[PDB]
Amino acid sequence: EFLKPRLVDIEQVSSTHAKVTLEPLERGFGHTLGNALRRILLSSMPGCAVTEVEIDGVLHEYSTKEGVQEDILEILLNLKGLAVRVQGKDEVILTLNKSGIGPVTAADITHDGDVEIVKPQHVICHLTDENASISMRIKVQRGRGYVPASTRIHSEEDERPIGRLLVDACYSPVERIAYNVEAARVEQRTDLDKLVIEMETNGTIDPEEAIRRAATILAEQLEAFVDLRD
Amino acid sequence: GVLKIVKVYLAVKRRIQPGDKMAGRHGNKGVISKINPIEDMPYDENGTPV
């Protein structure tokens, strides 16, 4: 004699906001599913983010291209916050060529079907000379969590070039996740709760797809208790 | 006596870690004791962790 909740409306307030609600919760399971989901979404959602950049005529990070008005040490710290969602493959290799005076927004990356940039109003660098020219070849990967460049070196396998600029990659499509159980109301039941997971992605991953991939990370892990091995 | 010198640099970039010694302005030192995960940190009413 129990009740089990079902998905309900998804008030997509904005592009990076969301509010998914879980209607018919039995009493006592409010804070049990919430905090067991907030600790999953914030931790283990597979995202995609840049892995290693490569510019045309520069050898190391602390250089300074001629024509741009940033050190290369800040062109990598602007790419790392690039949001992109590949659909078909697992990894890509983007491109970027531009020439002229004017800021190089992220929308100038070469267009592909699978790769789909999300924040095209982004800024990457500036160009401030009529004969200036920047031409890089960004990389992209899938994963989860966070893997700094120093620890992704143990699997280097003879990274032959000296033009590869390694970036640290923090794949995760979630930023902050609140939730507040409140007094739901079925037609006749003295106490039924409602969960309201006010999520906030970086425009990458769909809300309803997160929760359906944060539940099966739980429901797949409880097997080891449903069958105690002894 | 010296025949020819050579001078090489190295731009090592060191992150933060347990052991480093942060401190405020008012004379309150402290050695960083642990680097938590993103979600063990006390979150206020709107998820923003300290």
From Swiss-Prot, chain B:
Gene name as annotated: rpoB
Superkingdom per UniProt: Bacteria
Organism: Escherichia coli (strain K12)
Family named by the database record: Belongs to the RNA polymerase beta chain family.
Protein name, entry field: DNA-directed RNA polymerase subunit beta
Summary of subunit composition and partner proteins: The RNAP catalytic core consists of 2 alpha, 1 beta, 1 beta' and 1 omega subunit. When a sigma factor is associated with the core the holoenzyme is formed, which can initiate transcription. The rRNA transcription and antitermination complex (rrnTAC) consists of RNAP, NusA, NusB, NusE (rpsJ), NusG, SubB, ribosomal protein S4, DNA and precursor rRNA; S4 is more flexible than other subunits. In pull-down experiments interacts with CedA. (Microbial infection) Interacts (via flap domain) with Escherichia phage lambda antitermination protein Q; this interaction renders bacterial RNAP resistant to transcription pausing and allows it to read through termination signals.
Function statement: DNA-dependent RNA polymerase (RNAP) catalyzes the transcription of DNA into RNA using the four ribonucleoside triphosphates as substrates.
Residues of the full protein shown: 1045 to 1094 of 1342
Industrial and biotechnological uses noted in the record: Co-administration of salinamide and rifampicin or salinamide and myxopyronin suppresses the emergence of resistance to both antibiotics.
Post-translational modification: Acetylated on several lysine residues in the presence of glucose.
